[PDB]
Amino acid sequence: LITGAGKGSIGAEVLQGLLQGGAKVVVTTSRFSKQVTDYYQSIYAKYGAKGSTLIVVPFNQGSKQDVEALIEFIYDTEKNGGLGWDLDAIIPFAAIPEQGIELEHIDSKSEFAHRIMLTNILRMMGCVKKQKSARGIETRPAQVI
Amino acid sequence: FQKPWFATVNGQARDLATMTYEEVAKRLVELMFIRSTNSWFDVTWRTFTGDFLRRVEERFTKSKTLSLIQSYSLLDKPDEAIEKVFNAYPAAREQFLNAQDIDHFLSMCQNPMQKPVPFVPVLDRRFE
Amino acid sequence: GVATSFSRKKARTFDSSWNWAKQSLLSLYFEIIHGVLKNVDREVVSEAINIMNRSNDALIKFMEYHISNTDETKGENYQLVKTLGEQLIENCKQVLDVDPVYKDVAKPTGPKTAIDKNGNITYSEEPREKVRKLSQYVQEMALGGPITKESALDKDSTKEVASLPNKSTISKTVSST
Amino acid sequence: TRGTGLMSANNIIAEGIEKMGVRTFSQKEMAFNLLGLLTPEVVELCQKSPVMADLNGGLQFVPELKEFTAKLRKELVETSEVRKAVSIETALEHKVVNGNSADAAYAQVEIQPRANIQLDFPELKPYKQVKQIAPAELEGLLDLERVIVVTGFAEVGPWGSARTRWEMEAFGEFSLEGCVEMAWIMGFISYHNGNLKGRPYTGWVDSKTKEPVDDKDVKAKYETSILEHSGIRLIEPELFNGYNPEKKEMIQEVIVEEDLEPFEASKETAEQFKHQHGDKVDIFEIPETGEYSVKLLKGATLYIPKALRFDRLVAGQIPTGWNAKTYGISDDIISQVDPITLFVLVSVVEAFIASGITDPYEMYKYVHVSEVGNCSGSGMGGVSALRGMFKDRFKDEPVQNDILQESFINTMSAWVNMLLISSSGPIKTPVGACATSVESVDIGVETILSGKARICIVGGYDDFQEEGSFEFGNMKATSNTLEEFEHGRTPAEMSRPATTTRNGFMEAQGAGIQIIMQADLALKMGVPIYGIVAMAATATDKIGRSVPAPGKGILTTAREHHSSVKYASPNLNMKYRKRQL
Amino acid sequence: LRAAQQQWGNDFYKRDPRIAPLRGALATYGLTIDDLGVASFHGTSTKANDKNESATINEMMKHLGRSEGNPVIGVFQKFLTGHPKGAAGAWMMNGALQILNSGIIPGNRNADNVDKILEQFEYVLYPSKTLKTDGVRAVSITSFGFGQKGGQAIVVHPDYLYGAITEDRYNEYVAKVSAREKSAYKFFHNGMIYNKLFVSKEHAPYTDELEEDVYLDPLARVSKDKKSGSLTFNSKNIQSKD
Q1: Which residue pairs form cystines in this protein (chain E)?
Q2: Nearest CB to B96; choose among E185, E192, E193
Q3: N or C terminus of chain A: which is more exposed, having fewer CB within 10 Å?
Q4: SS3 breakdown of chain C: % helix, strand, coil, rounded to 5?
Q5: To the nearest 5 percent, what fractions of chain A are helix, strand and coil?
Q6: How far is it, in rounded angstroms, from Cα D417 to Cα D410?
């Protein structure tokens, strides 16, 4: 599962590498649009090796409800409309840039950013631990990076 | 008459519409550039012929480029300037004049700030 | 900011590598034939790796047919494609039933800041002198620097393609260095 | 990590920080570093105990990194600013000493391109090159009166002409020529030749403001407008007589519970109200005027309008601004014929221009008037005239008396013969629904190979209207546009053939025409030849109860007996066939 | 002569049950089944149609023993235009002629992800981006209408015709064509700027007195009227000995 892997980011190059080596990846976008789904289609068609599979979902890592829903979607069975996956890695690289906000300026944007970059990363890990423990998966841990 | 039919290639009566861009620029030189004196009869006639060679480049170029005729001075050796223009743009040797370029040519033939051209370019209401 | 975006219905699934393999080959095959890619360009090796990582029987037949039916007498480009074509089929037969690999063969770049005589600041990425592969990049990393102290590519791609399936036996590790 | 170029992530000082024998990273290197942590060795390690990896490149051993990077920026900025101030002062000195007389010799005249729209005729090779591709035995083997060629084609559709559609199909972007043609079609630019706000101007002008427009500027001024108002896009009501699929007018029958207020109406209209309702109305003359008063009693039947919200909101419509007048179809024709006929009339002249035949009568220097056929056809025909005769006539709106004849599928081919061709050729109008255009070629081929004609117009046309949209939606043939928006799909990306998530077709409108001839006559007349029609078959399928189910009947075009194939038939070998000739 | 050329050049396969109508069609010009490069599929973006069509083309190619590893390159032009019903095949046919004469094969840019079901059809390839080939020799065009209408046209590259005439007849042709391309360009640009590409005829090429005479004479042809400059039938050239 990779967050923050938009175009011209470290995440995008990680993603090419994962597909190149046959990974099944869920990449999340914060700007879901035709320009984005065209981007990712062109990546997969260039790089996606045999047995690879890129799923691209809209997402707002700043939302608790999105975080729960996304992990619930990845782990729900194909019968219920999920992927019926079981994560081996999570690479939560989703950020928003804060510039020239020194201590006196910390306001809404910084408290929101803190939710994306910390609080909701703990909630993704929480959700992944609840889904794996629901199904009694004790020997296939997800490497958080 | 002293003002001949302009669109006459090798003595074959024709029409501006059914002349090539090469044929039009060679005919301008034939009618507006005196071989004995080896110069343009009027500077405004040279300007009329340069304008037309620029218009050729505009029609047959694919991208923004520098003109091959930077000063109309270069037309004081007209045969060279014509060969230089139609070698860059050899399509223009074969294509007939665009209808936009006919209209432009007949509109330069009516410029009040130039010596009247020494030829009838078209039979219409303005023939008199 | 906390407005939901996610919905299972907007999930887009890309999984048809079987079909994009053939397109990747055919794009390369006609790129080479029209001299868009030459025998020196790294892009020829990158595209090979990606074709090898999608190798199956249906792709090996697709390559065998197109390369066999190429007439090398029509042009130098047609000979270059046919030589590389044969090489790529040899690789794609070898790596059938082998796991696909991540292998970056892009030329490693370093920063260059240049100020001109008119004081315009331009930043480019230029190729490093010492490091022209990732193998060498990992060697440069293992050697550190003075501050960290405490108390076949670019010349012929067709031969560099023939070396892709061969898992190079590491004599002595970079960790020893 | 270094972002893209210049400003991002302080790239300008990266070379500077690297001069301490610290390393900075490309994204591709930092990606490779991080995938190092998904290798099985480091994964196995992560599972023993948590793994902290430093991919910092020694940047931790630089003391006061804030101060050190601020110093590097300030040592670049001072050096850039100095040289800028010295460059500004040598440019001013040079200005003063040389004025603008020795500075005017440097400036050169640029040539801005003008659209030069070619007709893209086929490139004929030298005979040596075109003798290579065919075997030598071919020469004098074929009867060229039995070889059908396509000599010209055109279409009116969602992306305008065949030239413009082809640009957007092959390259997904307009050329200069493509923009100008799409701007002219859509009516953004008209041509002007004359005096325009005094001085004389010969060229394109904005069709609204009459402001001059250069060819270079047409991409800058109108491409966004052209791309917005072409192709598969939200149904524009202005193009469909105010049809809005979000507000689709139906009428419910209601019984009057208590009497209405009397309204005024003419004698004839009141007698009509009386005839219909019988006892349930009262008509009374008003002696002052002679105009009657209609009074609907209790138990009378009325019709109250109600709007339905429909879920097909997107179609392949012809670019907004497209107008038959732009091609020069007179208002007397536009007011008479169905809108579909206007697409055919334009497609037919535009095909004749593609075939190098500007005056169709030229054909009759080479062939009899009985030898030019029209083998073209439609699926549903003039569906605006059907609406007219079934709905608008019911609602006693004003409709042309001859609306019936405009409705008929064979009436587009009538107008073509009546306005342009004036042949007495065969006229075989097929109706094949979505296979009408391939049936047209099948009939037009069979017509030439039979001697009944030597040229045929072929092809197909169909319009998009309210009733057909709705009915394709009740048959669930078309894509539900609400479901597409649920899945985050924009209009453009709703027609996605061969994909996992395809869910019905996108309705469109327009016409396509080809001109086909015998090859023998094409060579004689010297018309371009864009291809040979080698085959054209049709086929039904089998016993079933589903009319819209597609089947495998056309598989019969590849029927051959393979019991006895031990030795190749000599009849397939061209050397043999040429010998027997 | 013509009947012999027809018996051996054109219609050599009409009576032969060992040769397909689709094989004979190509074989006529010396093409084999492998030379069919591009299939312009109906490809409506419906579940039933797009599978059915792929399966149909696959089974044709397999029965006519097309080379393994040589799929037809499917072209789904309706990703861009949508489905105009009657006009569908006409648009396909125009894009087939534009594929042959350019050798560019357009890609389905909405082919996000090709249906897994279509992998079983090894004789079909579904590109998502435009290929500049060295050349396309023939193009199939398959349509499937409502009411069990199925169609197929084959269109062959027009260069396979010119190898069937003499160098003198070909060079005559090429001279005539160039003359006509120049006059057509002239007409096009003039009709574009003055909104007069379309010009309705006011009259038939014959008056009403000649109408029956022109119909009944098969060798009646038109000729420029010296006065009006228009192509008309002239009484003198109807039931003429000449």
Answers
A1: none
A2: E185
A3: C
A4: 45, 10, 45
A5: 45, 15, 40
A6: 11
First to last CA, chain A: 10
Question: How far is C70 from chain E, CA to nearest CA, in Å?
Answer: 11
**Token pair for E133:** 């080939």
Instruction: Please name the member of D140, D557, D561 whose beta carbon is closest to the beta carbon of E60.
Output: D557
Mutate to test the interface with B, among D111, D176, D177, D202 (most CBs of B within 10 A): D111
Neighbours of chain E (3+ CB pairs under 8 A): A, B, C, D
d(CA C63, CA E67): 12
Quote the CA–CA distance of A102 and C112 in Å, as a whole number: 31
Distance, CA of C127 to CA of C139 (rounded, Å): 17
Q: What is the DSSP letter of C91?
A: H
Tell me how the structure was determined: cryo-EM
Chain D to chain E Cβ contacts (< 8 Å): 569
Tokens representing residue B8 in the block: 């006459």
CB-CB neighbors (< 8 A) of C19 in chain D: none
Tokens representing residue D223 in the block: 């491409």
Q: Which of C66, C71, C69 is nearest to C29 (CA)?
A: C66
> Could you tell me the two tokens for D325?
């007048």
Q: Please identify among residues 60-89 of chain C the ones whose CB lies closer than 8 Å to any CB of chain E.
A: 60-66
- The candidate with the shortest Cα–Cα distance to E28, out of D479, D572, D170, A125, is D572
Structural resolution in Å: 2.9
In three-state secondary structure terms, A120 is: helix
Which element (helix H / strand E) includes A89? strand A89-92
Residues D186, D183: Cα–Cα separation, whole Å:
5
**Phi then psi for E74, rounded to 5 degrees?**
-55, 140
Give E113's contacts in chain D (Cβ within 8 Å): 499-501
Min Cα distance A111 → chain D (Å) is 23
Instruction: Return the axis-axis angle of helices E88-100 and D162-170, rounded to nearest 10°.
Output: 70
**Class in CATH terms, B6-122:** mainly alpha
**Residues 191-210, chain E, touching B (beta carbon < 8 A):** 192-194
Pick the CATH number of D108-243+311-563 from 2.60.40.10, 3.40.50.2000, 3.40.47.10, 3.40.30.10: 3.40.47.10
CB environment B20-34: b (16+ within 10 A), e (fewer): bbbbbbbbbbebbbe
Alpha carbons within 13 A on the beta-carbon side of E228: 10
Q: Does A33 touch chain E (CB under 8 A)?
A: no
Query: Count of CB atoms within 10 A of residue A25's CB?
Result: 22
Is E189 among the catalytic positions?
A: no
B64: distance to nearest CA of chain D, Å?
5
Q: Do E146 and D117 touch (CB under 8 A)?
A: no
List E residues 44-63 in contact with D (Cβ-Cβ < 8 A): 44-50, 52-56, 59-61, 63
D352-355: which pairs have CB atoms within 8 A and are 24 or more residues apart?
Answer: D352/D152, D352/D420, D352/D515, D353/D119, D353/D152, D353/D154, D353/E184, D353/E187, D353/E188, D353/E191, D353/E197, D354/D119, D354/D152, D354/D153, D354/D154, D354/D162, D354/D515, D354/D528, D354/D530, D355/D151, D355/D152, D355/D515, D355/D527, D355/D528
